[PDB]
Structure 1
Amino acid sequence: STGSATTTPIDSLDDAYITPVQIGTPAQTLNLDFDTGSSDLWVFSSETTASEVDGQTIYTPSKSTTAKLLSGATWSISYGDGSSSSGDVYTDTVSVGGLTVTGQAVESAKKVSSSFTEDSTIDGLLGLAFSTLNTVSPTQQKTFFDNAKASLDSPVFTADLGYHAPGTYNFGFIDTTAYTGSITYTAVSTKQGFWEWTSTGYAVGSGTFKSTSIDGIADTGTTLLYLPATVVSAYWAQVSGAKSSSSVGGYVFPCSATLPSFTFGVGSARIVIPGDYIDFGPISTGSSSCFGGIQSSAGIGINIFGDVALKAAFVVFNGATTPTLGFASK
């Protein structure tokens, strides 16, 4: 089997991407944030504290003939941006782009933090990291991908995120029309439960490539590119007037600037992030200070190849017995 679904930016900045997901019988379609950095499929629901729902579409398990309470199971998750959610668990039929999993754990939110309430466009998350990170207790649950894997034509999914435009998540096949050149594959460590890999270095603009190992995670649920302070300083030093602002919470730059590209290494291959991808716009409405899309990972504890980086590539998440990651230009 295979699946193919379009993923759409939630706003003009590509702050996140939503993908329609069918849950239950008859189908209830919710728009979920596919997140390769976590492993819970959770939804706003009929059980979510009413004051914490503001415009989201909810899952109502009582209206699904295939929903079953997973008795005794609870979940609770905290994300890197400080947001969180928690609740109980149902199993139900879940379909993505024509690919159907029966008996998927669908984690129903009883509580969500303010960041989630305030984002009316995201109805929940669908985690695509390794199932060892799943938070369901006392019986850990599998991700949608892990459940689908054995049925897939090939044990892979691909992320093809657009810049200010829709893109695609495919399951079970590699669309050879969706990228240019060849795909370069690189080793993955699953020791922390992430799609963790080592970039071979970077360049700023038309500058020379610096060969240096940068360990980080491929994370579709993180907006920006978070790299070591040395790398980030080297990038922003090429933008006149750019500075790190503790009050704003990272590097800012004059909105009048033209940003240089940023290149990252995948083995002997190179992925180029155009400068425009690094512009996240005014820090507040009408400001001439703009927020940077490359930020320091210092004090996160991990480097993160978030959407800024991933949207510059066609990315293969290979879930074979020995997982790997593939990157191609497009």
Structure 2
Amino acid sequence: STGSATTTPIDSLDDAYITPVQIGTPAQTLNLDFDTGSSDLWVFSSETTASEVDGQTIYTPSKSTTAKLLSGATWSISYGDGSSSSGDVYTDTVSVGGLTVTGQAVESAKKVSSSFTEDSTIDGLLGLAFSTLNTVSPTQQKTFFDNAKASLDSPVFTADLGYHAPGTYNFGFIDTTAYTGSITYTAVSTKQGFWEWTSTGYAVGSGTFKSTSIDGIADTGTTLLYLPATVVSAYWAQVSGAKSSSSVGGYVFPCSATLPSFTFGVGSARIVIPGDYIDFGPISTGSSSCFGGIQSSAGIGINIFGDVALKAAFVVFNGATTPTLGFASK
């Protein structure tokens, strides 16, 4: 089997992407944030504290003939941005782009933090990291991908995120028309539960390539590119007037600037992030100070190849017995 779904930016800055997901019988369609940095599929629901719902579409398990309470199971998660949610668990039928899993744990939110409430466009998350990170207790549950894997034509999914435009998540096959040149595959460590890999270096604009190992995760649920402070300093030093602002919370730059590109290495191959991808616009409405899309990972404790990086590539998440990551230009 295969699946293919379109994923759409939630706003004009590509702050995140939502992908329609069918849950239950009859189908209830929720727009979820596909997140290769976490491993819970959780949804706004009929159980969510009413004051914490503001425009989201909810899952109502009592209207699904295939929903079953997973008795005793609870969940609770906190993300790298400080947001969080928690609740109980149903199993139900879940389909993405024609691909169906029966008995998928659907984690029903009783509580969500303010940032989820404030984002009316995201109805929940669908995690695609490794199931070892799943927070369901006392019986850990599998991701949608994990559940689907054996039935897939090939044990893979691919992320093809657009820049200010829709893209595609595919399950079970590699669309050879969706990228240019060849796909370069690189080793993954699952020891932290993430799609963790090592980039072979970077260049800034037309500058020379610096060979240097950068350990990081491929994370579709993170907006920006977070890298070591040395690398980030080297990038922003090429932008006149750019500076790190503690008050704002990162590197800002004059909105009048033309940003240089940023290249990262995948083995002997190179992925180029155009400078426009690194512009996240005025720090506040009408400001002439703009927020940068490359930020320091210092104090995160890990480097994150978020959407800024991943949307410059066609990315294969290979879930074979020995998992690997593939990157192609597009």
Task: Please tell me whether residue 80 in structure 1 is matched to residue 80 in structure 2.
Answer: yes
Cα displacement (A) at 1:225: 0.0
For residues 116 and 279 of structure 2, the distance between their equivalents in structure 1, rounded to whole angstroms, comes to 24
The normalised TM-score by structure 1 is: 1.00
For residues 179 and 143 of structure 1, the distance between their equivalents in structure 2, rounded to whole angstroms, comes to 27
For residues 6 and 286 of structure 2, the distance between their equivalents in structure 1, rounded to whole angstroms, comes to 32
Cα displacement (A) at 1:73: 0.0
Q: Which residue of 1 aligns with 2:12?
A: 12
Cα displacement (A) at 1:208: 0.1
Cα displacement (A) at 1:235: 0.0
For residues 316 and 167 of structure 1, the distance between their equivalents in structure 2, rounded to whole angstroms, comes to 14
Cα displacement (A) at 1:151: 0.1
For residues 160 and 73 of structure 1, the distance between their equivalents in structure 2, rounded to whole angstroms, comes to 34
For residues 203 and 216 of structure 1, the distance between their equivalents in structure 2, rounded to whole angstroms, comes to 17
Q: Deviations over 1:11-33 (max 9, x none)?
A: 00000000000000000000000
Task: Please tell me whether residue 93 in structure 1 is matched to residue 93 in structure 2.
Answer: yes
Q: Which residue of 1 aligns with 2:301?
A: 301
Cα displacement (A) at 1:142: 0.0
Cα displacement (A) at 1:170: 0.0
Q: Paired residues, what number?
A: 330
SS in structure 2 of the partner of residue 213 of structure 1: strand
For residues 4 and 144 of structure 1, the distance between their equivalents in structure 2, rounded to whole angstroms, comes to 14
For residues 289 and 59 of structure 1, the distance between their equivalents in structure 2, rounded to whole angstroms, comes to 40
Cα displacement (A) at 1:325: 0.0
Cα displacement (A) at 1:171: 0.0
Q: Which residue of 2 aligns with 1:176?
A: 176
For residues 6 and 20 of structure 1, the distance between their equivalents in structure 2, rounded to whole angstroms, comes to 8
For residues 77 and 196 of structure 2, the distance between their equivalents in structure 1, rounded to whole angstroms, comes to 20
SS in structure 2 of the partner of residue 92 of structure 1: strand
Q: Deviations over 1:108-158 (max 9, x none)?
A: 000000000000000000000000000000000000000000000000000
For residues 149 and 236 of structure 1, the distance between their equivalents in structure 2, rounded to whole angstroms, comes to 41
Runs of 4+ in 1 over 4 A off after TM superposition: none
Cα displacement (A) at 1:310: 0.0
For residues 143 and 191 of structure 2, the distance between their equivalents in structure 1, rounded to whole angstroms, comes to 17
For residues 208 and 238 of structure 2, the distance between their equivalents in structure 1, rounded to whole angstroms, comes to 13
Aligned-CA RMSD value:
0.1
For residues 302 and 115 of structure 2, the distance between their equivalents in structure 1, rounded to whole angstroms, comes to 22
For residues 174 and 163 of structure 1, the distance between their equivalents in structure 2, rounded to whole angstroms, comes to 20
For residues 115 and 155 of structure 1, the distance between their equivalents in structure 2, rounded to whole angstroms, comes to 34
Q: Deviations over 1:61-111 (max 9, x none)?
A: 000000000000000000000000000000000000000000000000000
For residues 134 and 154 of structure 2, the distance between their equivalents in structure 1, rounded to whole angstroms, comes to 23
Q: Deviations over 1:270-318 (max 9, x none)?
A: 0000000000000000000000000000000000000000000000000
The normalised TM-score by structure 2 is: 1.00
Cα displacement (A) at 1:209: 0.0
For residues 79 and 258 of structure 1, the distance between their equivalents in structure 2, rounded to whole angstroms, comes to 32
For residues 190 and 99 of structure 2, the distance between their equivalents in structure 1, rounded to whole angstroms, comes to 25
SS in structure 1 of the partner of residue 71 of structure 2: strand
For residues 251 and 22 of structure 1, the distance between their equivalents in structure 2, rounded to whole angstroms, comes to 39
Cα displacement (A) at 1:319: 0.1
Task: Please tell me whether residue 162 in structure 1 is matched to residue 162 in structure 2.
Answer: yes
Cα displacement (A) at 1:174: 0.0
Cα displacement (A) at 1:261: 0.0
SS in structure 2 of the partner of residue 170 of structure 1: strand
Percent identity, aligned pairs only, is 100
Alignment gaps of 5+ in structure 1: none
Q: Deviations over 1:189-220 (max 9, x none)?
A: 00000000000000000000000000000000
For residues 191 and 153 of structure 1, the distance between their equivalents in structure 2, rounded to whole angstroms, comes to 26
SS in structure 1 of the partner of residue 30 of structure 2: strand
Alignment gaps of 5+ in structure 2: none
For residues 289 and 242 of structure 1, the distance between their equivalents in structure 2, rounded to whole angstroms, comes to 9
SS in structure 1 of the partner of residue 147 of structure 2: helix
SS in structure 2 of the partner of residue 126 of structure 1: strand
